[PDB]
Paper text:
CHIP has three domains: an N-terminal TPR (tetratricopeptide repeat) domain through which it binds Hsp70 or Hsp90, a middle helical domain that mediates CHIP dimerization, and a C-terminal U-box domain that binds specific E2 enzymes.
We crystallized a complex of the Zebrafish CHIP U-box and UbcH5a and solved its structure to 2.9 Å resolution by molecular replacement. The crystal asymmetric unit contains a back-to-back U-box dimer, with each U-box bound to an UbcH5a molecule. The U-box conformation and dimerization mode are essentially identical to those in previously described structures of free CHIP (rmsd < 0.4 Å), emphasizing that the U-box undergoes negligible conformational change upon binding to an E2 enzyme. The interface buries ~700 Å2 of solvent-accessible surface area. On this loop, the motif S-P-A (residues 94–96 of UbcH5a or residues 96–98 of Ubc13) makes a hydrogen bond with the carbonyl group of CHIP-P269 and van der Waals contacts with CHIP-H260, V264 and V270.
Residue numbers in the entry:
A (entry chain A), B (entry chain B): -1 to 147
C (entry chain C), D (entry chain D): 207 to 278
The structure:
Amino acid sequence: GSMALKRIQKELQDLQRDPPAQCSAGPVGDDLFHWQATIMGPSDSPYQGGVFFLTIHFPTDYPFKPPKVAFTTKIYHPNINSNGSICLDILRSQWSPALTVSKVLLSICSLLCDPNPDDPLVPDIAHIYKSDKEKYNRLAREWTQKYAM
Amino acid sequence: GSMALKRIQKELQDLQRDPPAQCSAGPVGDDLFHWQATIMGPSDSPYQGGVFFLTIHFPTDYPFKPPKVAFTTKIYHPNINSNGSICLDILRSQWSPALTVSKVLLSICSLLCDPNPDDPLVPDIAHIYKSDKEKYNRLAREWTQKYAM
Amino acid sequence: EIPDYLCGKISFELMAEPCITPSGITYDRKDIEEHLQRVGHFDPVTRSPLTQDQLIPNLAMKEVIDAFIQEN
Amino acid sequence: EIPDYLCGKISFELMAEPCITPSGITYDRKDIEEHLQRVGHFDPVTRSPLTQDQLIPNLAMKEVIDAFIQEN
Ligand SMILES: [Cl-]
Ligand SMILES: [Cl-]
Ligand SMILES: [Cl-]
């Protein structure tokens, strides 16, 4: 049962040893069941030059249940709603105990670089994205400046 | 390929660093396929005090085929006949590439302390064994003294 | 530092009871068994179908471990 | 000095292509297959029934062997 805590700890020991590119994570006070993580704009995305903060909450079944990951920093993206909720496979139906937070963080960076407009959380952005690509990059850039810079 | 030779060389290595109790064995010339092994009559058996010699011939497709093991010294035993043939399932239908001469050797020994008359090769001795078991030991120790001492 | 191949794909801790899946992947009986129950009937790594009765004891690996638990 | 658990129960030599049987025993594919095709369809050690298709690639061991090969 408390294997969860043991596992979460190795991951942390591992993560901070070799951080995922552009990312950083660490405990938020006590119980490693709660982490803080920051992601630097995908350079390669219109999020570049931005710093984003996310909260990782490990369930009690971890790693048998995926971690609860969300953005606290506002972000204009079709797969992330205003609540910082992330529409990630690997966080939902494609989770596995073999996967790690580190992996999840890379997956999220990947998602910033290339949104997935067919499985959105914000229909409206998904549309702009698919129709007017430029308008999309502009707002993303604007929002990065306003909220993540 | 000539994996047989490599396998036989290794077996020999093991067998010689830790030989079956009471036994000894080694290649004849530099013919690792022609071995000679000797056995000291065990300590209760009427074979006690005798020295038995056997020839081991490894088939070219060893260890997929069993080795040809025969007594060259005469012995009064129900499972070992006049021309040194040994009746030991493991050398026949029960052969397995995983088995080794060391194992075969051990069997032959135990097979000397505890003959198996229910599966004869030499009926008479098997019979004399079943019934007048006392007469058996008389002739066994007799043959040992006449042919193995 | 323990070699990785001697640890669980789930537990990350050294393997106490290493059993293999038809995918060649080795887990610690305890962990993989709960995964099949709590997560689903698929190989945690390959994701191919998998059931508890398909787990084979990776004996060789069981002794490679003990062998390591030797010098340490 | 090569440990035993790294050698094929048939070849007696280090294992090039380790793979385990349902009985949970590792052999070197080439040797275990020569056996299944020339001797019989059973586990050389447990004698349970066995066939080529039932052989899982013991990946863990495969690494363990590479490791050993490095320092030697
Ligand atoms: Cl595991
Ligand atoms: Cl083998
Ligand atoms: Cl094994």
